[PDB]
Amino acid sequence: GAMAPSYRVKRMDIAKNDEECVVNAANPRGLPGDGVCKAVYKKWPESFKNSATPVGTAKTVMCGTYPVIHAVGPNFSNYTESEGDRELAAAYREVAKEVTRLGVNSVAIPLLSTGVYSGGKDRLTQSLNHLFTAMDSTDADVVIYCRDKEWEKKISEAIQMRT
Ligand SMILES: [Cl-]
Numbered sequence: 001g002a003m004a005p006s007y008r009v010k011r012m013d014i015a016k017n018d019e020e021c022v023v024n025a026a027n028p029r030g031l032p033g034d035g036v037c038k039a040v041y042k043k044w045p046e047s048f049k050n051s052a053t054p055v056g057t058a059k060t061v062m063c064g065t066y067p068v069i070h071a072v073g074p075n076f077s078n079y080t081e082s083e084g085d086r087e088l089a090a091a092y093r094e095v096a097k098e099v100t101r102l103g104v105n106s107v108a109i110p111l112l113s114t115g116v117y118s119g120g121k122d123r124l125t126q127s128l129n130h131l132f133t134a135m136d137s138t139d140a141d142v143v144i145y146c147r148d149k150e151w152e153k154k155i156s157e158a159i160q161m162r163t
């Protein structure tokens, strides 16, 4: 574990992370996809061998010795708010199990279902709270990666609020 497990947020490409593993915002089919998923495909294409997995699950594939945890959040275009919320919380619980199993001291993680799977809604708080619910009991340093300054500010505030 990390000596003093923390949360941090950085505004930059998760493909350039400084952590011991990465969480992909994957699609269920292991396709290159869009946004975070396409950046992860460019950086770690070998990790997309048999990475297909259902919504609400995570499947880890090694790129060399670097673990890529493919976490499939729900596409809120297709799910009801209620069912989408359940699957989004489930995907993060599976990430916590994988991070634990791998024995890493740090993990780079995007906010699941906040981009092209958001169904056009702002899900920063929903997604981040499900991330905390899953990851709080883990002792890995968690580094959240986002794109926009206003998201960075809100995520930072939410982390600092808990202390
Ligand atoms: Cl960048």
Ligand SMILES: [Cl-]
Pocket (backbone or CB within 6 Å): 025, 112, 113, 114, 115, 116, 117, 118
């Ligand atoms: Cl997304």
